[PDB]
Amino acid sequence: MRIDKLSLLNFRCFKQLDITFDEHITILVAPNGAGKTTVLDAVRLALFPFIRGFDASLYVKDKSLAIRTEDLRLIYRQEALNMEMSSPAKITATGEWASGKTATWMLDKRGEQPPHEDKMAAQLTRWGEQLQKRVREEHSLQQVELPLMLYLGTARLWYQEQRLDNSAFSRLSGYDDCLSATSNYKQFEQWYSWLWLSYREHQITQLESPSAKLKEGVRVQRMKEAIQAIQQAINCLTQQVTGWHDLEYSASHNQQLVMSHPQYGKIPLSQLSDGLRNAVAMVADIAFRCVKLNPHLQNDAALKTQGIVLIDEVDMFLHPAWQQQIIQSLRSAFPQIQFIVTTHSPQVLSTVKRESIRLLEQDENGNGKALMPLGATYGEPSNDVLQSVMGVDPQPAVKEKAD
Amino acid sequence: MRIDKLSLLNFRCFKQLDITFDEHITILVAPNGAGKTTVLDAVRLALFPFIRGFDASLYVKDKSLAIRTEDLRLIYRQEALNMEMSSPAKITATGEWASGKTATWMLDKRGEQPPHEDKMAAQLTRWGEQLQKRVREEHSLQQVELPLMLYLGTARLWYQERYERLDNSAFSRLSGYDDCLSATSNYKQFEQWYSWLWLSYREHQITQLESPSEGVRVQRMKEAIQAIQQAINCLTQQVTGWHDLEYSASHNQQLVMSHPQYGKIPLSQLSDGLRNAVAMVADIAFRCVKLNPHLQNDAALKTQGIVLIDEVDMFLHPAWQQQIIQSLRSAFPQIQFIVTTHSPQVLSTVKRESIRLLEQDENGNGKALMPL
Amino acid sequence: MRIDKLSLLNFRCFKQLDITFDEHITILVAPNGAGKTTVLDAVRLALFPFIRGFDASLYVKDKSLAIRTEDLRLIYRQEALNMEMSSPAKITATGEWASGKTATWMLDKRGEQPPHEDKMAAQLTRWGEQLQKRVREEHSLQQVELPLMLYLGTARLWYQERYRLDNSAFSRLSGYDDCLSATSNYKQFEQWYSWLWLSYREHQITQLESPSAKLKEGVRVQRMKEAIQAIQQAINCLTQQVTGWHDLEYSASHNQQLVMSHPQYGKIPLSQLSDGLRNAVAMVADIAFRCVKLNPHLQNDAALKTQGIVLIDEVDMFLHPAWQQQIIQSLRSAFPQIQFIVTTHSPQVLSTVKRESIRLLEQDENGNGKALMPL
Amino acid sequence: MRIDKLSLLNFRCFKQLDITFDEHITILVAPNGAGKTTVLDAVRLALFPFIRGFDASLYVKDKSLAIRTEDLRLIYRQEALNMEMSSPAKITATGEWASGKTATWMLDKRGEQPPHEDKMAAQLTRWGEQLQKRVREEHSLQQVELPLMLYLGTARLWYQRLDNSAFSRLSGYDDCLSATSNYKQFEQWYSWLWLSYREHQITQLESPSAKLKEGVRVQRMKEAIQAIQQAINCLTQQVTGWHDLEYSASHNQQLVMSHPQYGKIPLSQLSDGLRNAVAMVADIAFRCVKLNPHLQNDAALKTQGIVLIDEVDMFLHPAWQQQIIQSLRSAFPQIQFIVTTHSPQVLSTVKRESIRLLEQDENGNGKALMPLGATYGEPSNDVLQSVMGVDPQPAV
Amino acid sequence: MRIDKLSLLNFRCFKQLDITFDEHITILVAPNGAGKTTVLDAVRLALFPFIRGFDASLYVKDKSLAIRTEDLRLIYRQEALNMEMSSPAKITATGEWASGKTATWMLDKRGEQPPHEDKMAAQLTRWGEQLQKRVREEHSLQQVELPLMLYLGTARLWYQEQRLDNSAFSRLSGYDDCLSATSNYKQFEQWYSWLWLSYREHQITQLESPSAKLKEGVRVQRMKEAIQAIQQAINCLTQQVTGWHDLEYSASHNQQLVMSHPQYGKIPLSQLSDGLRNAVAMVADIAFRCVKLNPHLQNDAALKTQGIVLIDEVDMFLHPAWQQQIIQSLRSAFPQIQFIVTTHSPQVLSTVKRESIRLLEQDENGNGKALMPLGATYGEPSNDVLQSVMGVDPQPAVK
Ligand SMILES: Nc1ncnc2c1ncn2[C@@H]1O[C@H](COP(=O)(O)OP(=O)(O)OP(=O)(O)O)[C@@H](O)[C@H]1O
Ligand SMILES: Nc1ncnc2c1ncn2[C@@H]1O[C@H](COP(=O)(O)OP(=O)(O)OP(=O)(O)O)[C@@H](O)[C@H]1O
Ligand SMILES: Nc1ncnc2c1ncn2[C@@H]1O[C@H](COP(=O)(O)OP(=O)(O)OP(=O)(O)O)[C@@H](O)[C@H]1O
């Protein structure tokens, strides 16, 4: 899918808001308040009707992907004892799906009544069901490429029957917990370790009985090509800056995943710096979902998949020299995916053009605005974008500054 | 939101009944088993649609707020020693909703099918929804006035050892319709709200004493407390001497009252009559204050609506019974009261145009007539 | 287990009070705030040790069954606008426990220390324990008679929409289950009475189908029948004459409910009847089924011959003035051997009672109380 | 469903075995480690496919309901001192699925290759499908009779409607091949049944004029109680004087039995062994009643099927071991019982044709033969010595 | 410890009962109703005060180990509407806590009040505390052997940091769940597998640096002695009848325990007969507790330990040829243990003398008796015992 515009009425901290998104990358910036998380949560709420069109979502019954009563706006008046609600709360999303079907759907809630969806939201659910039914077919010969929907929150580090080849399952399992706020690192490492050990054992039984190479040669090829695809994506981000590359599984290291550096050798990933582990988590989260969704590519599943990814605090635990490389690395690893990210770093903001930047501001009554920066930011020194866009002086207000 | 006339057909003990109500006070007088609770149940069933037009009604668990199969009249065939169920049960109400808006609505049930309402009954829900919509509007010029709606049955009583932070919905005007027609006790709701009032007021006092450096919120809180306290005084002070209900931290964070000869004592340690009368009056008063903030000091004296009281004279001694009706008329001069009793002392100095004596026939045809 | 005299010192509103009780019925008459509930609470506290001498008392959760710091009288000093607490609070009771056994016992509390009792209270507990031991004996020749002990406060009321057997519920001593607590005891009676009726109907069905085993099985049927009719007559002594309703019974046709009948009206469940009828029926049944359970060997004079003390607060709730003129005599007729102590403020309840049964409660400006017979 | 012959080869401990069963009752007799649970598990696997398509048993997928790699026989050489994993595992079953409809099916497994059944077993599966669809109808003059499949193992001893619907009818196949029968569940559901029946009896006492109000769900209850009482009477009424197990509110809210001289006695004062036997018989009768409503009280006396019992004499006094087999025969005269035992008091009351002595040579050439002596009416010592070759004199 | 007599008053199904126990083996027989489980439960309740003085007690809150209200007698009379209890319920035990000192302690409960113990029960707890504190001090030259207390119920098969050498723990862990009614085979298998893997890994480590042989030779020896004793005990029961022996742990069989037969090779224990599994469970349950309680015996912990073992349905899942060998096998593997067992098998009853047999009979009012068989039972044909002690004719009542 793709989202081109969003409109909010009486949502958490916005009386009214209209925001448009860039096709490839758009960065949200907010000097103060909680506007960015509000926008991300609204977008993540607007995408749930599609995921509800898959019975795999039966595994998720979270009471957080629908509008709640506490999401409505409360107005406190200093001179009144009573405090009322603002009703209704509306989320209106304009976008494109089917690669040619433009649409505009809406969700709303009235006070304490259950939330109500309009017709086009049900149509989005139905379009989600069409893909499910067309994928479950066995006689089908035409191939189907599913879209990707992922959410990466700020709590993606706290909480820290496998099947790869095509099937009814193993393709709808790429939508499991795809919009949750918890960490999803265990279900990646288990899958990766199972894949590695099963691939090695398949090769073992292959050279043990070469006569049975009728179909045990293509299977090994697929299990190898998936690993290649994942490793290339991870390297694209880690290698050129830190030197570590080729995430691998080594039974020797107490059944634990490890990486390798040209000079420091092989070390477990669980004992590297915070930034590298965070980056690996993000890129793996995207990549293994991409591969599990489109096995029929098996070498470019990370280079031709389409969808939307939401990232809060993209450059967390990264030093400035790494903050000038994250965005382009994400673009290069996933060239046909929409990214919506939040950031604070002036280093990041100097690596994108002013058309990919939204600055959020709120009025005294709650009216919101999402504007573009007047000045230029592409290829500029950090101190220039620090004061032109964020309004922060580069020379600290030390005692001697007054003179 | 006056109600003027009521009609019943095949309801519990009445084959048919017609009753007319007085604008301010009407008293139903009859012995046990004559149908005094039946009339009040019919009235609250007729009034519930308006409340159904609100969000506070989503938490109503009272199963007696809808017509039930047990409400259909049963006839005893003595020859065959049999009971036969007559159908349908019907409740018709006539009245006025707002200024210059007269209406007639109807409720019905047949056999064991779910109950049914007519066309004009849904417009009552629509009016409730429109009022709720108007209250929730930012930057409005016109004021909205809300009518009071309350049912005080025998479930209100405070017996021995009953011992019956605020949610964000408890700060709304419409929280005045929370369990307003249910068969329940509503004392703890009031106690929490009143304690919050007193603690905020004391906070403002402490700040304006310590470091003078806002001034309208204190006035609002003070006026609210004054309204509620005067309402309770109107009933308790003259007969018993206990006047001023307050929140006290010295007494282990409790509600207390004062006496001139006796000192300051918690409300839970006072007698049955005191506790029940105070709960009864407070139940009306704090809702009056919450529903219409803009009056600010005449909230109890100027609010309109309907209050139903079953057995208004429970736990009150004969000298107290001779004052209850006038005290209620003095505290709330603009409310329509419908009350039931069987005690003659409650009627000592009441006009004959406010009394309805209830009677039936051998076939169950009822009458509700003024005394001669 | 008669009680004859009561004394109070520094107890709630009374600085000191002496009151004497009549052998059968005593009525306390006064307005609100005069101390009618205080006297009954003091009697509860004086009687609770005997019940403490039983196992059923192990499940008592009522915190008002012991003297509390809130029961100590407070004096208001108007000059200083102060409240000062008097100490100690004291309760003295005189009476007779068994035939030819007169006693005087005392309860005390000072300040905020735990309450304390004297020796005779412990002897009362010991008597209770010995009675329990005698009841739990196999192959005994002597009979044991148990006294009734019950408190019916305002917590008994049956308001709108207010409303398998354990092996201990089949004991005689289960007649002392929550007998002095501030609670409602309707469900106990309902469950046990339903069990009675179902067993009786089982026996009827069996004797209709296979008339071959009514020998030493018919005696049990006789006992059940006699118990049912005792309870039914006790309830009839109060409702039939004024209201016309009678013969409470279990009905499976009416969705397995307790039901009453009327000559002009039909047969209707008890939960659909009026307030006065429901409350009067609950009040009388509460005494009747305990009378039946405590003394199985009387078999149909259980209510007519049992002895004990019953305390009733506001005996005339929900009853109209023509019903109030009959309550006292109805209670005396149903239970001729029980000592009743009741409170009221309604004159109609005193229409035809002797003046030697009335105690008017008065106080002076300093808190010294009197409970005097009317002139 | 009836079986007439079973053949095995390369199964757990049998290199090859051929056993022919009896029409009504057959008892497998052998000492420990002689292939009795083996034969019962083989028969249990053989009859599974008929259950796989009943819309309630197509949910349960137990590893014990299909052949496993551990069932493949292992040979010992004694020279290399290693265990040879033989293959393949084979089961071939011969029986009848309906009136005069002979059949023969087979199942196999090789190494780690998942076992693959023949299409002749899918014939049985679709036969079960046809039966379930035929019963699902609500209008037909013909009456559909279902068979009872039941397996009670050595783990049998631990852990609300009789409508003629397609749900209650198919409740008879609930865990039928992994069934358990203890006393607590039995008393629970029997008490519920009796309470529901007494409600209607008392209602008819109070208001005789309303006889016709009910009677669809009531006759079901009455006749089910009659059938269960019949079966339990067949169990207990001869050895002791008890009969007519019943629920009594008067007698302490308990299940009781009646004795012409001793009166009523509660069921909870009996030994824990006889209580479980009563529970077993009652559970079989209740399943029979639920399966075939259209008999309503002879459902137990006219249902057909196969019941497998391992250690039929478990936790039974030597007095009760002499009447269990005849009681089971008298309570269900149209069922095929296959039971395992090693007691000599169990075999002292049956005829030789039912007895099956199991043997196995040094390789696995299993035999299942008949005794050369006699057992019916014989004393315990003669049965011991002749059948089991165990001297009645202890070697002190 | 030892128990010589027991007396019950107003317990579950006995108005009163007196029963004496043989020094080595005593068998309870009851033809009708309950009563054997009642006696076993009473004995198991009379021993809890000892285990209470070891910190492995009602902290875990096994409410079954104290007298409960449902354990009191309850008399139903048909001609009375009421039903009272019989109070109090008393259990009186006479025994010997150690060689030389006899004792008589009592437990009782009155109606619904909490159960009450006399002085000697507290003294028994104090003796347990004495043994605990003496065990916890290693600053001593002389050793003391702990006593064994075990209970094996009928539900012992329903749902079938390791430290061996001496320590503060590893000796008080032999009292964990020693009187519970659940199955305790999982912990045994875990401990046994840990012991075997440690033994093999450490004898492999010996090959690496034999310099520490003097310390790694004794330690390994320990793990090689315990095993031996355990195995021997098992082989005393499951070999002369079936031929299997030498219970072992082998990772090559998917890391599960296996046993060996001369002709059938090595097979996992999970796929053997029911009788073999039951017997192995019982004997292992006794043996590993014996070894964990007295390591210093170090080769005969299963041959010199003392204590009491209670077994309900000892001969369950055993064929008659094996029912003539169980009792002597138990006596041979554990020659200094007291055994109290229940059976209803004539084969078992013919292998013991009439002095070791108690027949339980109950009166109409609940009075109980535990008598001895009048006739002889030692070395007699099965039927003689069948109709002499149990009153069952050997000729079935066929048509
Ligand atoms: N379904 C029914 N059919 C016929 N009569 C009924 C039915 N349900 C109730 N009744 C009778 O109608 C009477 C109505 O009495 P109700 O309690 O309403 O009046 P009241 O006694 O004056 O009031 P209260 O004492 O509650 O203040 C009930 O007492 C009962 O006798
Ligand atoms: N600790 C105390 N010290 C002094 N006075 C007290 C204290 N506690 C309560 N009181 C006063 O004593 C009065 C006793 O009145 P009480 O409730 O006992 O009698 P009543 O009104 O006749 O009874 P009821 O209405 O409950 O039938 C209470 O109302 C209260 O005013
Ligand atoms: N895969 C196998 N290969 C070889 N022998 C096996 C295999 N599985 C089990 N066995 C042997 O088969 C025998 C199992 O006997 P079985 O399970 O039939 O018990 P049973 O004692 O005859 O019956 P019951 O359980 O009724 O007492 C044992 O000897 C066991 O060693």
Instruction: Please tell me which chains touch C, using 3 or more CB pairs under 8 Å as the contact test.
Output: B, D, E
Tokens of A267: 């070390």
Tokens of C64: 């008002």
For A261, the enclosing helix (H) or strand (E) is strand A256-261
Tokens of D119: 């299409």
Residue from C371, C322, C312 nearest C348 by CA: C322
Helices (H), A243-388: 274-293, 301-304, 320-323, 326-333, 346-349, 382-388
Ligand nearest to the CA of C363: 2
Ramachandran angles phi, psi of B141, nearest 5°: -85, -45
Give yes or no for residue D73 CB within 6 A of ligand 3: yes
Q: What is the DSSP string of C224-273?
A: HHHHHHHHHHHHHHHHHHHH--EEEEEESTTSSEEEEE-SSS-EEEGGGS
Ligand 3 centroid, distance to D33 Cα (angstroms): 5
The answer to whether residues B168 and A74 touch, using CB atoms and an 8 Å cutoff, is yes
> How far apart are the C-alpha atoms of B166 and B189, rounded to whole Å?
9
Number of neighbouring beta carbons within 10 Å of residue C15: 17
How many CA atoms within 13 Å lie on the side-chain side of B152? 25
Q: What is the DSSP string of E39-93?
A: HHHHHHHHHHHHHHTTT-STTS--GGGS--GGGS-B---TT-S---B---EEEEE
Assign C94 to helix, strand or coil.
strand
Ligand nearest to the CA of B33: 1
Which residue's CA is the closest to the ligand 3 atom numbered 15? Answer: D33
> How far apart are the C-alpha atoms of B277 and B198, rounded to whole Å?
21
Which residue's CA is the closest to the ligand 1 atom numbered 21? Answer: B33
Range C317-345 burial, b when 16+ CB lie within 10 A, else e: bbbbbebbbbbbebbeebbeebbbbbbbb
> How far apart are the C-alpha atoms of B34 and B359, rounded to whole Å?
7
Shortest Cα–Cα distance, C167 to chain D (Å): 9
Ligand nearest to the CA of B71: 1
The answer to whether residues A267 and A261 touch, using CB atoms and an 8 Å cutoff, is yes
Q: Which atom of ligand 1 is nearest to the CA of B358?
A: 22
Peptide bond connecting E88 to the previous residue in cis, omega within 30 degrees of 0: yes
Chain B contact present for A86, CB below 8 A:
yes
Chain A contact present for B52, CB below 8 A:
no
Check CB contact under 8 Å for A82 and B172. Answer: yes
Number of neighbouring beta carbons within 10 Å of residue C109: 23
> How far apart are the C-alpha atoms of E164 and E292, rounded to whole Å?
7
C328-331: long-range pairs with CB below 8 Å, 24+: C328/C25, C328/C27, C328/C353, C330/C237, C330/C238, C330/C241, C331/C25, C331/C238
Range B5-27 burial, b when 16+ CB lie within 10 A, else e: ebbbbbbbbbbebebebbeebbb
Give yes or no for residue B290 CB within 6 A of ligand 1: no
Note the resolution in Å, 1 decimal.
2.6
Number of neighbouring beta carbons within 10 Å of residue B345: 18
Q: Which residues pair with C331 in a beta bridge?
A: none
> How far apart are the C-alpha atoms of B298 and C354, rounded to whole Å?
53
Residue from E111, E17, E87 nearest C137 by CA: E87
Q: What is the DSSP string of B286-322?
A: HHHHHH-GGGSSSHHHH--EEEEESSTTTT--HHHHT
Shortest Cα–Cα distance, C162 to chain E (Å): 30
> How far apart are the C-alpha atoms of B50 and B151, rounded to whole Å?
14
Chain E contact present for C170, CB below 8 A:
yes
**β E337-342/E357-362 pair status:** unpaired
Residue A1: C-alpha distances to residues A23, A38, A103, A126 (Å): 11, 21, 11, 14
> How far apart are the C-alpha atoms of C132 and E349, rounded to whole Å?
47
Q: Listing from the earlier edge strand, what are the strands of the sheet with A245-250?
A: A245-250, A256-261, A265-268
> How far apart are the C-alpha atoms of C176 and B290, rounded to whole Å?
48
Chain C contact present for D201, CB below 8 A:
yes
Instruction: Find tokens 């209707």 and name the residue.
Output: C268
Residues in B closer than 8 angstroms to A80, CB to CB, are 220, 293
> How far apart are the C-alpha atoms of B189 and B185, rounded to whole Å?
9
**β A307-311/A265-268 pair status:** unpaired
Tokens of A129: 């069901």
Residue from D289, D248, D294, D296 nearest D268 by CA: D248
> How far apart are the C-alpha atoms of C309 and C337, rounded to whole Å?
10
For chain A, give the number of residues.
403
Q: Listing from the earlier edge strand, what are the strands of the sheet with B89-96?
A: B16-20, B3-9, B89-96, B102-109, B116-117
Sequence-separated (6 or more) residues with CB below 8 Å from residue E221: none
Instruction: Find tokens 């919905």 and name the residue.
Output: B169
The answer to whether residues D176 and D150 touch, using CB atoms and an 8 Å cutoff, is yes
Distance of CA D241 to the CA centre of its chain: 26
Query: Beta strands of chain C (E only): which ranges?
Result: 3-11, 14-20, 25-29, 74-77, 82-85, 89-96, 102-109, 116-117, 148-152, 246-251, 257-261, 267-269, 308-312, 338-344, 358-363, 369-372
> How far apart are the C-alpha atoms of D238 and B17, rounded to whole Å?
71
> How far apart are the C-alpha atoms of A68 and B168, rounded to whole Å?
14
Ligand nearest to the CA of D366: 3
> How far apart are the C-alpha atoms of A188 and A288, rounded to whole Å?
7
Closest residue in C to D196 (Cα) is C252
| Amino acid, single-letter form, for residue B43 | V
Among E261, E270, E272, E319, which is best to mutate for testing ligand 3, by the most ligand atoms less than 8 A from CB? Answer: E272
Tokens of A335: 């060239």
Q: Which residues pair with A91 in a beta bridge?
A: A8, A107
Check CB contact under 8 Å for D271 and E398. Answer: no
Tell me the Ramachandran region of residue D349: left when phi exceeds 0, alpha when psi lies from -120 to 50, beta otherwise. Answer: alpha
> How far apart are the C-alpha atoms of D103 and D122, rounded to whole Å?
12
How many CA atoms within 13 Å lie on the side-chain side of A211? 0
The answer to whether residues E357 and E19 touch, using CB atoms and an 8 Å cutoff, is no
Q: What is the DSSP string of E197-223?
A: HHHHHHHHHHHH-GGGHHHHHHHHHHH
| Amino acid, single-letter form, for residue E314 | V
Q: Which residues pair with D243 in a beta bridge?
A: D258
> How far apart are the C-alpha atoms of C146 and D181, rounded to whole Å?
47
Ligand 1 centroid, distance to B34 Cα (angstroms): 7
| Amino acid, single-letter form, for residue D218 | V
To 10 degrees, what angle do helices B215-240 and B187-210 make?
Answer: 130
Tokens of B45: 């069933």
Residue from E200, E176, E188, E275 nearest E230 by CA: E188
For chain E, give the number of residues.
399
**β E116-117/E101-109 pair status:** antiparallel
Residue from E274, E378, E399, E255 nearest E327 by CA: E378
Q: Which residues pair with D355 in a beta bridge?
A: D27
Instruction: Find tokens 């022919």 and name the residue.
Output: D20
Query: Beta strands of E86-207 (E only): which ranges?
Result: 89-98, 101-109, 116-117, 148-152
Which residues is chain C interrupted after (C–N above 2.5 Å)?
163
The answer to whether residues D383 and D351 touch, using CB atoms and an 8 Å cutoff, is no
Check CB contact under 8 Å for D203 and C164. Answer: no
Sequence-separated (6 or more) residues with CB below 8 Å from residue E33: D269, D270, D271, E13, E362
> How far apart are the C-alpha atoms of E288 and E173, rounded to whole Å?
11
Check CB contact under 8 Å for D207 and C164. Answer: no
3-state secondary structure chain D: CEEEEEEEECCCCCCEEEECCCCCEEEEECCCCCCCHHHHHHHHHHCCHHHCCCCCCCCCCCHHHCCCHHHCCEEECCCCCCEEECCCEEEEEEEEEECCEEEEEEEEEECCECCCCCHHHHHHHHHHHHHHHHHCCCCCCCCCCCEEEEEECCCCCCCCCCCCCCCCHHHHHCCCCCCCCCHHHHHHHHHHHHHHHHHHHHHHHHCHHHHHHCCHHHHHHHHHHHHHHHHHHHHHCCCCCCEEEEEECCCCCEEEEEECCCEEEEHHHCCHHHHHHHHHHHHHHHHHHHHCCCCCCCHHHHCEEEEEEECCCCCCCCCHHHCHHHHHHHHCCCEEEEEEECCHHHHCCCCHHHEEEEECCCCCECEEECCCCCCCCCCHHHHHHHHHCCCCCCCC
Which residue's CA is the closest to the ligand 2 atom numbered 30? Answer: B270
Chain E contact present for C218, CB below 8 A:
no
Q: Which residues pair with A106 in a beta bridge?
A: A92
Angle at D261 between CA D258 and CA D265, to 5 degrees: 35
For chain C, give the number of residues.
375
> How far apart are the C-alpha atoms of E293 and E336, rounded to whole Å?
15
Number of neighbouring beta carbons within 10 Å of residue B52: 20
Establish whether chain E is in contact with chain C, requiring a minimum of 3 CB pairs below 8 angstroms: yes
> How far apart are the C-alpha atoms of E319 and E325, rounded to whole Å?
10
- A119 burial level (CB within 10 Å; 0-12, 13-18, 19+): exposed
Number of neighbouring beta carbons within 10 Å of residue B108: 18
**β B264-266/B254-258 pair status:** antiparallel
**β C148-152/A265-268 pair status:** unpaired
> How far apart are the C-alpha atoms of B178 and B188, rounded to whole Å?
12
Tokens of E229: 């004793």
Q: What is the DSSP string of A170-204?
A: SSSGGGTTSS-SS---HHHHHHHHHHHHHHHHHHH
The answer to whether residues E11 and E368 touch, using CB atoms and an 8 Å cutoff, is no
Minimum-distance CB partner of B171 among A79, A82, A86: A82
| Amino acid, single-letter form, for residue B38 | T
Residues in D closer than 8 angstroms to C252, CB to CB, are 199, 202-203, 206
Technique used: cryo-EM
In chain E, % helix, strand, coil (3-state, to 5) comes to 40, 20, 40
How many CA atoms within 13 Å lie on the side-chain side of E272? 26
Chain C contact present for E140, CB below 8 A:
no
Tokens of C68: 């509390």
Residue from D304, D303, D343, D305 nearest D324 by CA: D343
Tokens of A78: 């200093």
